[PDB]
Ligand binder design. Structure first.
Ligand SMILES: Nc1ncnc2c1ncn2[C@@H]1O[C@H](CSCC[C@H](N)C(=O)O)[C@@H](O)[C@H]1O
Ligand SMILES: Nc1ncnc2c1ncn2[C@@H]1O[C@H](CSCC[C@H](N)C(=O)O)[C@@H](O)[C@H]1O
Lengths: 259, 261
RNA sequence: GUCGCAUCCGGGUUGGGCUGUUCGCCCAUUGCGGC
């Protein structure tokens, strides 16, 4: 039963999931690492194949829930992993397919809108921040891949439960308009400090790639806000900016007043 | 004054070795990659020993050398020396700076960060970039990844060279803090106080722990207050650099007119 | 998993760790194919 050779045909099929085209073709993707597998399961994703290395714990096998369990050697593990030093627990899950059509927001939502194409590592970090602050919705560009290994790793698995939706620009604009959601453009040259916006009644922050925001979006915004920069640096990391904006809104919703 | 073409030239291997912390210690030199970062190291007063120019360098780059040796690298030799998938066209070999807390004085209400056991150079660089944005008066790096790693330099966009950032032994951080009579505020996910409810308008030192294990218990006890940033989702903790930025900007908000919660 | 070819002392061509994972990262230390 053990799969020992990196050349075994099953290892070949599992390592091919590293490529987005194969993930699309098969409807499957790899989740590497015990914590990320736990989070994918707790999020309700369908585990198809559990992969266990030689150092897996007894409890790891109990995660399978009726999926096929494969025991791989270190050498077979190394061909599937995205890491120089592989995890001992990985899962092959079915790709989730979520549409914004159903989504209904409450009266004072906290929304992040990510415009443009961000690097996978930065995106994963943004989504962790969004999860921490309890964002009700994150919108990203139509072709964004939420199930790359960097997004999964840098999100610490937060990507699985987070309401994040890749959508066309017009679909995003329409959704926001139909919610009558105030748009707040975050830009280093914003006319107001970000503490001066009022986010107690619901906000959609607009954020560009580490890049910048498109002009028509900045102009449509009710307000453009800047994070003060007191040294020589001109800008902060996008994930950091996303966290600063979201936690500011949380502060106000916790009783804080606009500056 | 030399043109190097072979990636296997002896100089090139010497230069790529500077990516190892161990070679930087052995030699006393380090590599600064990227035109902006070289500008910042120069502006900060660091000694440039060797300027490296790639094929797409521009004429003004050569005038940065100020009497250092200037080496011309082909695209292939440049690839070996670069720490990047896509190499920069301007790089400098500088002498490692000598900085001590001996000559540091703080004003009445300084804003300080103490980083304990951080291991990811990208995290350190993002923190330094936030400290720069927020105007921190001092950053103590206690026993973590090395301050002059390529990713610290790159992710701080060179702010590492001008920021008042100092690597210290953990026990020296404790002594410097006691010496300065600075209130210590321990950031930890289980902290009893929401971070917005601390008053940071007086002197304050925020304490941040390691990515994996967090803050040691002894440091939590030293703190006057343990503060937490609320977590509302599935994640149990935030990234250490995001945490640092959130703390720095809450203090800035308060110092800019805002009231504690 | 296994098998050469190197190479270094027959014997070795490493251990670990990681809440940013990417020409992945960190820390002790002491290669290159094929199937
Ligand atoms: N100090 C700051 N104030 C406001 N938004 C900021 C910021 N630093 C970064 N951001 C946000 O982070 C994104 C990526 S950072 C790129 C900044 C770029 N020079 C620009 O002019 O936008 C930006 O699009 C912006 O939305
Ligand atoms: N929600 C939060 N509140 C306060 N500090 C936090 C935080 N998330 C991360 N940090 C900071 O980031 C550092 C690394 S996070 C380490 C997490 C570890 N599981 C633990 O229990 O601490 C922590 O030591 C702390 O200084």
């Amino acid at each position: 039963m053990r799969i020992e050779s990196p050349q075994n045909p099953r290892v070949k099929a599992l390592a091919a999931l590293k490529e987005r085209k194969e993930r699309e073709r098969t409807g499957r993707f790899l989740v590497e690492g015990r914590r990320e597998v736990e989070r994918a399961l707790e999020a309700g994703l369908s585990l198809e194949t559990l992969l266990l290395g030689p150092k897996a714990r007894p409890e790891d096998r109990a995660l399978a829930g009726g999926a096929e369990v494969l025991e791989l050697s270190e050498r077979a593990l190394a061909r599937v992993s995205a890491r120089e030093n592989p995890a001992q627990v990985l899962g092959v899950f079915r790709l989730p397919r979520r549409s914004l059509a159903g989504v209904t927001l409450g009266a004072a939502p906290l929304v992040l809108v990510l415009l443009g194409l961000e690097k996978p590592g930065n995106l994963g970090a943004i989504l962790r921040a969004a999860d921490g602050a309890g964002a009700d919705l994150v919108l990203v560009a139509e072709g964004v891949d939420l199930f790359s290994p960097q997004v999964i790793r840098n999100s610490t698995g937060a990507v699985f439960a987070l309401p994040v939706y890749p959508v066309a620009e017009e679909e995003a604009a329409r959704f926001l308009e139909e919610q009558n959601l105030p748009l707040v453009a975050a830009t280093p040259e914003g006319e107001r400090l970000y503490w001066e916006g009022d986010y107690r009644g619901g906000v959609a922050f607009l954020l560009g790639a580490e890049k910048g925001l498109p002009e028509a979006w900045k102009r449509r915004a009710q307000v453009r806000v800047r994070i003060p920069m007191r040294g020589r640096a001109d800008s902060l990391n996008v994930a950091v900016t996303a966290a600063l904006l979201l936690y500011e809104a949380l502060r106000q919703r916790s009783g804080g007043a606009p500056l």
